[PDB]
Amino acid sequence: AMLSFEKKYRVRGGTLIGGDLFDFWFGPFYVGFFGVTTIFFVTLGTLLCVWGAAMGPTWNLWQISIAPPDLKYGLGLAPLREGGLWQIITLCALGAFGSWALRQAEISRKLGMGMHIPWAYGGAVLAYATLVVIRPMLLGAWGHGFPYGIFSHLDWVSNVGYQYLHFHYNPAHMIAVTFFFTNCLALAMHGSLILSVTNPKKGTPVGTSETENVFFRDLLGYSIGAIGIHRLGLFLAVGAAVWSAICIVISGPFWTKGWPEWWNWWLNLPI
Amino acid sequence: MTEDEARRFHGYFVTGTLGYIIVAAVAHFLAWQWRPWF
Amino acid sequence: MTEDEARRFHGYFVTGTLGYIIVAAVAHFLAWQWRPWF
Amino acid sequence: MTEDEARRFHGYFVTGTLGYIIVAAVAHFLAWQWRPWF
Amino acid sequence: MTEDEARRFHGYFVTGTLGYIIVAAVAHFLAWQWRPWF
Amino acid sequence: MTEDEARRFHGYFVTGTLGYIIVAAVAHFLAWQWRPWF
Amino acid sequence: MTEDEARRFHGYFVTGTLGYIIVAAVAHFLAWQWRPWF
Amino acid sequence: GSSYTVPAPEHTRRMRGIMIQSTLWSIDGKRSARERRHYRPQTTGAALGQ
Amino acid sequence: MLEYQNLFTRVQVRTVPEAGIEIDESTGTRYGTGTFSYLAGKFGDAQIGPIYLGWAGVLSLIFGFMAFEIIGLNMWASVGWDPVEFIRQLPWLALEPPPPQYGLRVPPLAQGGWYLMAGFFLTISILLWWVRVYRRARALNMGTHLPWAFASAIFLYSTFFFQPLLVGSWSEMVPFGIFPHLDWTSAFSIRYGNLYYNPFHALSIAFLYGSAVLFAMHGATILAVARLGGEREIEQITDRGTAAERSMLFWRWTMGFNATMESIHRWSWWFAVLTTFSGGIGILLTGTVVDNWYLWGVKHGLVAPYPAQNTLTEEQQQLLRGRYQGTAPDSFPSY
Amino acid sequence: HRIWLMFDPRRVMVAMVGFLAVLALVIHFILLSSQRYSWIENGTLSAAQAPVGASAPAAAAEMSPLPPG
Amino acid sequence: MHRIWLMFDPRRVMVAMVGFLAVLALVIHFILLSSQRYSWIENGTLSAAQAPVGAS
Amino acid sequence: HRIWLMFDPRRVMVAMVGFLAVLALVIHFILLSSQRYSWIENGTLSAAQAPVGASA
Amino acid sequence: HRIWLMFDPRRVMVAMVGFLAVLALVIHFILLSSQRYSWIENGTLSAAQAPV
Amino acid sequence: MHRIWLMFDPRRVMVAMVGFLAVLALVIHFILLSSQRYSWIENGTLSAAQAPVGAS
Amino acid sequence: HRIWLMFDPRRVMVAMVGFLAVLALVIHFILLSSQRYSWIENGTLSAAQAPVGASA
Amino acid sequence: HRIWLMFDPRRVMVAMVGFLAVLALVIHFILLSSQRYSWIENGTLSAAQAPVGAS
Amino acid sequence: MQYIDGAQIALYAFWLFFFGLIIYIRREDKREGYPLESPQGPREGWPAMPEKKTYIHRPT
């Protein structure tokens, strides 16, 4: 099945690895070399997640938890019973996340597009890599990563946040939250703006680009561009993930005490 | 839209509003018999 | 709206305003008998 | 707005303002009789 | 704005400021008799 | 903004500045009599 | 923008800088006699 | 408690934040701020003879 | 070297400022003429144009400034009117809610009256701003999607009033303060047993992350086809060009399914709205239906098992029993 | 008066009414939070019985559990 | 007096007035409900001598 | 009455009905949340046995 | 009067009314928050009984 | 020395000057208000001998 | 006097007044924050009675 | 000399004054935060009475 | 009752609402490029493609 305009776009070329062997479509999906690599890592990682569930006490979806090894194993590959299975799944996830990004770059190259989508996705991958690779390496043990469980990884976030007695006082966390909140507000504004022009008051014609700019100047005194809003949305969403990666990588590797005590520098200014 | 349309609608709006208030008054009378609030 | 139209609306408005204030005056006097606030 | 229109608005505005202040002064007299603040 | 209009506006502005300050002066003398701050 | 206009504004600015400082000097004199800070 | 009018500016700027520094020299001498910092 | 007695002003905190003692005061040692932390004692003009 | 990434604008045009589409000006008007910012034109549109002011906007500004003044003046009084301490300690200062024992009755002015007054004025200001947004939308014959998107956030904001009223105390309200409202967030989660196990809280987390994901995806997609004219979305919606086709095809080949140039904005709208809607429901159920979300999660099979880290003997079970927190001591005893 | 030529009466009236509304609400709310003029609770008291001199920054206990609702 | 309707649209004034009165009525009713003396839903049957009074 | 010439009956009916429905739900919910008028549980009690607020 | 040619009277008087309103609010608030001049509660006290 | 008014716009100088003077006056007034010695709202009636002095 | 040809006097004056004003406030505020020179409180003390920092 | 041909004197002057101003503030503030050279508090002490680091 | 509580009821009501919303948005997603072309013939997923939507343009 193809869209009514899809046939003329399904051409060869644009791949980073391979030729006509991996230049086909399986149903709607495009399969490249990195499509094949994605399926390998997804299948291996998911099957090992199912095995970790079978080793545990329950099949309940919310209660399944595959935990990282103890801190005493210290950057080694622990026994698979004792957390080594978590490390293997982590490698499969890294390979699948990397393959997904490279597969996206191949698709945009075939369509004559920019490379923005792979790099925007790389912000999320960087945050994940900080959580399970960079910060655990700086702290010296793979056991500093979070467990793989729907509600188990919420317990990790709670306990890690309270390792600094008040995680709200983290300066980088405060900035990252502002990025997340502003992004949600801007997305609601952008979604409303396009829909209100395209679906206007009943019986009236569809509005124009002037209508958007006039409306937001009337409301706020300033109207970002049609390209400005898409630049801002990319900046807010990706910057939220980048500031999240900073906020967690400075807790422990750089700051070990409580986060409220960090604000001594502001209170001890000479003035 | 016109004067005659306004008069016809007004007649039904007035009867509908007043009849609704009388039915609510009877409901308050029944509620008073059950558990008065003053 | 003309000056004559403004005159006609104003007559209904003061009557509606006066009727609203009078009914509120009865409500305040009823509440005073039940529980005076001074 | 013409100068005459400003003159007509000013007369109503001044009378309304001063009358409002007088009504507030009577309210302050009634409050003082009830519970003086000085 | 013109010079003839600036003269006429300056008269009401000065008289308005003069009256406002005099009311403030009377208010401060009232407050000083009631509870001096020095 | 010509030279003569700068001459006219400068005369009022200097007088206003020097007058303002003298009034502030009298204010500090009154504060010193009430509660000296040295 | 030229040398002739820059020389006129420099005379007022230098005399302003000298006056500012002289008042600061008097201020520091007053502070030293009141409470020396060395 | 079955009854409440009003403390002296010098024993009352100006700041009503619940966590102010552990998040700010435990790291703040400025003497001016420590002085501002509480209300100051008061009297009457008659008590002073004024 | 690298291609043009459409991240910034190097050549900016200047014309006469756009005064604006003619609208009804009986109860309001446009102020300013429209200036141009060189720094703002690099990122988006350069015009700092005229702003419309009417009845609702003026009233909203008056009420909001009253609330802001009350909050700031109470903050300043809390440090003894010290300006140095006011700036230095500003993140820690707060306008605190009333004490718990007053319930919903009026507190003293210095012990929560200012708080309630400022909250009332802020609520009135927010509602008047909503009215202003609605009028601005319908003056240009636009649909009212932004008013209802704003109403969702207003619903979440108003749960911070309705939950304390449902539990029966204004003491449970959010203090006005930078660090203090975070303190309230933490203590509210602790008091009601780990808000991580509130299902509507998890739902709002999911919609917040989904909003970030959707905006990253849409922004990257539009910037990737901006050289084909994809940033003119209205045109690509009423007359589908090759930029919309390429966006659709990219996402269909990547994911197996796609949206249109119009419906991706519906996705965005609904994710952003559902964030605050589910959050408000979750806050409303806390303390009124469920008092301990961890125990509710244990009830409904949400809590993963861990090995026990301690065991207690029976005498230890009786001794380690504590007392619920009560009143502060109003006396200084002498021993 | 010529002031209405400089300022449109339509624009001034809305600002004037809004200022009066906020000021009247502020004063009524301040009196409601005071001990002496909390008329909804103590309006029936005579002038002699009304509270006097009750500034008392810690007039009530700050820490306590919620009332038994 | 009637010329106020030429300066101000009756449609806008009436809608604003109804919104102001509705909010005012709700606020006053709610303030009385939250008080001790006038929480009429619970204690409305008490006589005037039995109703709560604030402390002297 | 010419109020309908300057106010659209369709919008008035929708706003009025919506206001009445929300008001009725609020009043019913306030009574249900109270002690005296929690009729789902205590509706069979007589007026003498129904809860009354604290008397002073 | 010539100052009114340099400055627009409309903007000056709006900024003057706004500044004085905030100043009056700030001063009345400071006195209300003080002990000596909390006139809502202390107003009936004589000058000798007022707090110092 | 009057030539500075051609280098700098008199209108912009007056606004900036008044704004700086207003902010400075408020800061000085409030610095004194928060001090023990110069509260003057609570302790203004004290004589200079009775006014507080910082510790030696 | 030839510096003013290389450097624009208008922006130099603004940067000079801006820097000196900020520097003056910083020094005044640093002294006000200290114990020896907290002149608002202890300005009436003599040089002998003024506080001195910790010694060895 | 020929350095002003390679570098604009106006750009050099601004960068140099900005660097010197920052360096002087950093040194003055580092000494102010120390114990031996907290001159605003202990400047009247003689060199023998000034604080010295341990050992 | 005992096991059934208000939070669970609200959660399931939200689930039903979300599924309905997803169906509506998926219907809106199929307003361009449909019906799909396949060798076997025309194809539509669930939900089916909606009716043709026409816009309104200003007169010249």
Ligand SMILES: CCCCCCCCCCCCCC(=O)OC[C@H](COP(=O)(O)OCC(O)COP(=O)(O)OC[C@@H](COC(=O)CCCCCCCCCCCCC)OC(=O)CCCCCCCCCCCCC)OC(=O)CCCCCCCCCCCCC
């Ligand atoms: C929320 C509401 C909506 C929720 C839902 C949202 C859905 C979103 C997506 C929308 C589209 C879905 C439909 C779709 O994808 O259809 C594809 C296909 C039609 O494909 P086609 O168009 O005929 O194919 C075109 C083209 O590829 C023709 O090539 P050819 O015909 O030569 O195919 C060669 C392929 C296939 O040969 C294989 O052997 C692949 C078999 C894959 C499935 C079985 C896996 C297990 C055995 C593995 C092999 C064993 C040895 C043979 O050969 C290839 O290599 C193709 C690429 C395969 C992937 C890359 C290589 C990976 C290699 C490493 C990993 C190996 C496996 C671990 O049609 C169907 O399969 C019909 C059924 C579709 C509905 C799904 C039914 C699922 C049932 C099971 C559900 C389980 C739930 C847990």
Ligand SMILES: CCCCCCCCCCCCCC(=O)OC[C@H](COP(=O)(O)OCC(O)COP(=O)(O)OC[C@@H](COC(=O)CCCCCCCCCCCCC)OC(=O)CCCCCCCCCCCCC)OC(=O)CCCCCCCCCCCCC
């Ligand atoms: C607490 C406060 C919170 C926070 C506050 C929450 C407040 C409520 C929010 C509700 C969602 C609003 C969504 C939205 O886009 O709003 C903007 C729109 C702007 O419309 P407009 O400016 O008046 O005019 C624009 C209009 O011309 C085009 O609008 P657009 O197309 O963008 O979206 C409006 C409609 C789509 O319109 C159509 O489909 C009409 C096309 C022609 C007729 C269709 C064929 C005939 C059908 C006949 C049978 C059908 C007849 C209806 O979109 C919507 O209304 C949203 C639809 C998706 C959401 C519902 C999905 C299903 C949910 C139930 C699932 C159940 C389980 C399976 O404003 C509206 O009011 C739209 C109309 C809303 C209709 C539903 C109202 C429901 C009220 C429920 C409570 C009533 C009191 C008890």
Ligand code: BCL
């Ligand atoms: C220890 C702390 C607790 C916790 C306690 C809470 C509490 C308590 C709440 C949340 C809520 C939220 N939390 Mg949580 N939260 C924790 C951990 C997390 C984590 C994480 C990394 O683990 C994440 C990602 C989140 C994320 C989120 C959001 C999804 C959600 C708020 C939505 C929103 O947009 O709010 C921002 C949006 C608004 C506030 C909307 C209203 C905005 C108004 C209209 C703005 C008016 C401004 C005015 C005009 C200007 C200022 C005026 C001046 C004040 C005068 N929480 C832990 C478990 N969280 C909320 C929620 O819904 O929970 C169910 C909530 O109340």
Ligand SMILES: CC[C@H]1c2cc3[nH]c4c(c3C)C(=O)[C@H](C(=O)OC)c4c3nc(cc4[nH]c(cc(n2)[C@@H]1C)c(C(C)=O)c4C)[C@@H](C)[C@@H]3CCC(=O)OC/C=C(\C)CCC[C@H](C)CCC[C@H](C)CCCC(C)C
């Ligand atoms: C979909 C949910 C998200 C959402 C949506 C949303 N918010 C919205 C909207 C929408 C759709 C609007 O239409 C509306 C709007 O107009 O946005 C531009 C709004 C809005 N969201 C806002 C804020 C906001 N939204 C938030 C969150 C969210 N908004 C959610 C994440 C938050 C957070 C995270 O807490 C905040 C703080 C506002 C910008 C605006 C509503 C404006 C409003 O109601 O204003 C009332 C007016 C006042 C309170 C007056 C204030 C007066 C000044 C404080 C005094 C000025 C003094 C002096 C002149 C200057 C002093 C400077 C200092 C103050 C810096």
Ligand SMILES: COC(C)(C)C/C=C/C(C)=C/C=C/C(C=O)=C/C=C/C(C)=C/C=C/C=C(C)/C=C/C=C(\C)CC/C=C(C)/C=C/C=C(\C)C(=O)O
């Ligand atoms: C403690 O609790 C708190 C809450 C705190 C306390 C507070 C309480 C408060 C503040 C309450 C406020 C109450 C209030 C006022 O504000 C309440 C106001 C109520 C009112 C006015 C109700 C009016 C109802 C009117 C109705 C039902 C009319 C129906 C019309 C009908 C049936 C006719 C339709 C038929 C037609 C048209 C025929 C077609 C004609 C055609 C086609 C033609 O004409 O051609």
Ligand SMILES: COC(C)(C)C/C=C/C(C)=C/C=C/C(C=O)=C/C=C/C(C)=C/C=C/C=C(C)/C=C/C=C(\C)CC/C=C(C)/C=C/C=C(\C)C(=O)O
């Ligand atoms: C708890 O402590 C706190 C709360 C803090 C204490 C504080 C309290 C405060 C500050 C209170 C403020 C109160 C206040 C403010 O001034 C109160 C002001 C109240 C006022 C003015 C009310 C006015 C009401 C007027 C009404 C109802 C009029 C209705 C008119 C109608 C229906 C006319 C219909 C006929 C028409 C339309 C003709 C058809 C058209 C025709 C023919 C045509 O077009 O031809």
Ligand SMILES: COC(C)(C)C/C=C/C(C)=C/C=C/C(C=O)=C/C=C/C(C)=C/C=C/C=C(C)/C=C/C=C(\C)CC/C=C(C)/C=C/C=C(\C)C(=O)O
């Ligand atoms: C802690 O304690 C704190 C609280 C801080 C202590 C507080 C301190 C402070 C700072 C208090 C401030 C008080 C204040 C500020 O100045 C008070 C100032 C009050 C003022 C000015 C009130 C003015 C009211 C004016 C009114 C009501 C006018 C009404 C006019 C009417 C009705 C006529 C209009 C109708 C017309 C024209 C129709 C003809 C049209 C025609 C012919 C046409 O259109 O053609």
Ligand SMILES: COC(C)(C)C/C=C/C(C)=C/C=C/C(C=O)=C/C=C/C(C)=C/C=C/C=C(C)/C=C/C=C(\C)CC/C=C(C)/C=C/C=C(\C)C(=O)O
């Ligand atoms: C701890 O700190 C704390 C304790 C806070 C210490 C704080 C200390 C400080 C820093 C205090 C500051 C005080 C201060 C200065 O700075 C205070 C400055 C006060 C001043 C200047 C007040 C001036 C008011 C002037 C008024 C009201 C004028 C009104 C004019 C009117 C009405 C006329 C209108 C015009 C007309 C009618 C013309 C018609 C049109 C015509 C003819 C036409 O169009 O032609």
Ligand SMILES: COC(C)(C)C/C=C/C(C)=C/C=C/C(C=O)=C/C=C/C(C)=C/C=C/C=C(C)/C=C/C=C(\C)CC/C=C(C)/C=C/C=C(\C)C(=O)O
């Ligand atoms: C711990 O404490 C801390 C705070 C930390 C310690 C720190 C202290 C510090 C740093 C203090 C700094 C102080 C300072 C800085 O230098 C102080 C500097 C003060 C100065 C210079 C004030 C100058 C005021 C000037 C005024 C008022 C002029 C008024 C002029 C008028 C009215 C004339 C009007 C013009 C007309 C009418 C023209 C008509 C138009 C015409 C003719 C035309 O048409 O052209």
Ligand SMILES: COC(C)(C)C/C=C/C(C)=C/C=C/C(C=O)=C/C=C/C(C)=C/C=C/C=C(C)/C=C/C=C(\C)CC/C=C(C)/C=C/C=C(\C)C(=O)O
């Ligand atoms: C621990 O404590 C810490 C703080 C850390 C330790 C600190 C350390 C540091 C780094 C200190 C730095 C100090 C410093 C740096 O060098 C200090 C540098 C000070 C300097 C240079 C001051 C110069 C002042 C000069 C002034 C004010 C001149 C004004 C001139 C005027 C008004 C006249 C202009 C008018 C004219 C011309 C009109 C004619 C117009 C004409 C003809 C026309 O229009 O054409």
Ligand SMILES: COC(C)(C)C/C=C/C(C)=C/C=C/C(C)=C/C=C/C(C)=C/C=C\C=C(C)\C=C\C=C(C)\C=C\C=C(C)\C=C\CC(C)(C)OC
């Ligand atoms: C010189 O400086 C001055 C003082 C002049 C001005 C400066 C001001 C400054 C610096 C202000 C600073 C303000 C800051 C930092 C504010 C911070 C605010 C924050 C972080 C707020 C965060 C959360 C607050 C929330 C969520 C509050 C919600 C409150 C609500 C919903 C309250 C509702 C209350 C109602 C509806 C009350 C009704 C009253 C009645 C009597 C009807 O019911 C009790």
Ligand SMILES: [Fe+3]
């Ligand atoms: Fe878009």
